[PDB]
Amino acid sequence: NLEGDALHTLRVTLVDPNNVLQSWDPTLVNPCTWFHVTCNNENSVIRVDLGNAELSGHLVPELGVLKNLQYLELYSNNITGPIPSNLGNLTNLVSLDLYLNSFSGPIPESLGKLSKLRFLRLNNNSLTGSIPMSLTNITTLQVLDLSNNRLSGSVPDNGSFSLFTPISFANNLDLCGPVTSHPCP
Amino acid sequence: SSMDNQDGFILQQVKLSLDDPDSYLSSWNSNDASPCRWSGVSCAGDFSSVTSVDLSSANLAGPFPSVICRLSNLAHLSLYNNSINSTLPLNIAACKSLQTLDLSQNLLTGELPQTLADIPTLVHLDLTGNNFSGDIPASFGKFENLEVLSLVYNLLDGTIPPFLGNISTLKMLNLSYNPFSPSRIPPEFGNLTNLEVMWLTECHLVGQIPDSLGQLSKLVDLDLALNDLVGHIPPSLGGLTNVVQIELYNNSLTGEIPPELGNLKSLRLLDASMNQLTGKIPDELCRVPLESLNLYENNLEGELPASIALSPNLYEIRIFGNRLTGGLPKDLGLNSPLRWLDVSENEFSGDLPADLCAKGELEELLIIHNSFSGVIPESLADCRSLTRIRLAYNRFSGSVPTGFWGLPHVNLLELVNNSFSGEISKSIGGASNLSLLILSNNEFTGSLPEEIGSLDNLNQLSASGNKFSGSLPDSLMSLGELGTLDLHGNQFSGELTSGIKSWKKLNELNLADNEFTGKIPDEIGSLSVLNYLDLSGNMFSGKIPVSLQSLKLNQLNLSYNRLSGDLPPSLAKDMYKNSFIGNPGLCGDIKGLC
């Protein structure tokens, strides 16, 4: 189906030395029997579990078509390139775990449209630029780690970010504001 | 002197015109009197005149060498699998003796030269795997002796031309994988009386299949798949005396499968899947000795005719996603080397046929979302050929045959949502290829066998909603490839051990609604990829281990246990309010717990 096609598109752009995606057969009616894919009772993908799989390569915008996806687990890998803006189209996403990768570029402003997100871990990446103010509109956000990145600018302290402590924003390039040491110009 | 030629000189001009990085044309030496012993060069007369040039797979780059046409006796030219680029020149017609032209798998771009129809000797034209664009030239209707026209995988963007029906000598029409302007199948294609192959896959075909196509008595392959064809499968198709293969899959076809298809004695492969076909599968078609019948994802209804079991050459039957009723043929698989059976998403009832794997070649048994009843046939316990078994969402009962557990090449065994009773046999140790075991929502009883731990490559164990009991086998903790362990809704008892540390690839651990006792092992923190943990509805006791806070968990439930002590400051928050309910000895800084 469309969800299977989207996940297969990801497989072709990922480099998979240990063949963890061997079960990802696009000829199947749905990807629910694929290992590392969990589906709901309506056979729609709710989890992708690909942590610590020695995966390299880049992500695809096609991941956005997974409308019911709740858990994206791509952590502890060597995935490079930008975080796709289309991840903001994952309306039901509860966890975005892209930590311990070589992701470069900005944290997309689109991620603010993830209304139900509770966990955002982008730590231990090479991400650059400012933390979007959109993220503060995520009422459900309870865990945030943007540490060990090359981010800069003011750290938002309103909305969801009100409760967030320094360990969340530690070891960044030039972050300023109350949670940080240096105040903002 | 009139029979003298400069063929060596002409071939040297071809060599000069083309880049040869790998030096395939090294044997072409201007010092040689004749080119007849040069690589890819054949002089079939012995009069020293070149008759054939085959430069296939030589990594040659450059435009088509028009000078080659000066070889007066050239009858065969192949430049297959090269980097020939630019436009095919109109002066190719100068090659007036050519019988076969293969320029396939090249970089040729632009419009087809109309002058190709001005070669009278031409019998075989293959321009497959090129970038040719625009309309097929009207000249193509006037080919004198052409038997094979192949323009597969090009960028042709015109309508399918009716004048191609005017090539009376044509045996093969191959226009597949072209971005054609949406067009109907010309009725004039029925005038191609010697046609053996009509390959029009992904040609953006619209409209109805013409009745005229029924007049193609010599046709062996009819492929109209991956198009937007509408209307009924014509009853005229019964006229296809020699047809062996018919592909109509992924169209918008409606109406009933014609009983006239039974008149096709030579038919072996029929795929009319992914259409909107209505009515019943005809008995007359099922009487034909078919090797493959795919009618899946249609609106078909009624009983599968028992005649399909009569075929001695059936290896593939895929009729899933219909409203088919009644039972499967009793003798299905008895007389045929059945490899792939998919009758899923139907209203089928009754016992599974006893001899599905009689010929010993069944690889895929897929019968999900049906009302199949009774026990797994004992014969399937000896079907070592099976790789994928999906008996889920049926009304099956009884003990699984002992052997069925230990089939060696089975990758997925799925028995979910049945009434299967009995125990998993020690024979499960024999399942060398087993990756996914899904036994959820059954009446399975007994202890998990120690031989389940012998399955080193097992990735998923899901046995929820069963009456499984006893302490987990020590071997289960030895499964280092296990990503999912779900044993919720069972009567499992005893304690977890330090051996859980070997579950290094475990993403989900669900032991909820069991009778587990003892402390949560400190080795729970050692599980790097654990993001989902449910130990709720057990009798787990002691202090929650400090190691748990090392884990990055998206799901935690330790509710309704006997856990005691304090919630560490890390776990003392509002997001964990429903994670620690129902533990009386437990108190933390959560508004409602204590």
Add this chain to the structure above:
Amino acid sequence: YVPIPPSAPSKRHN
């Protein structure tokens, strides 16, 4: 070299 899908039955299954 673009590989060419043969003329054959479709391959969708459960």
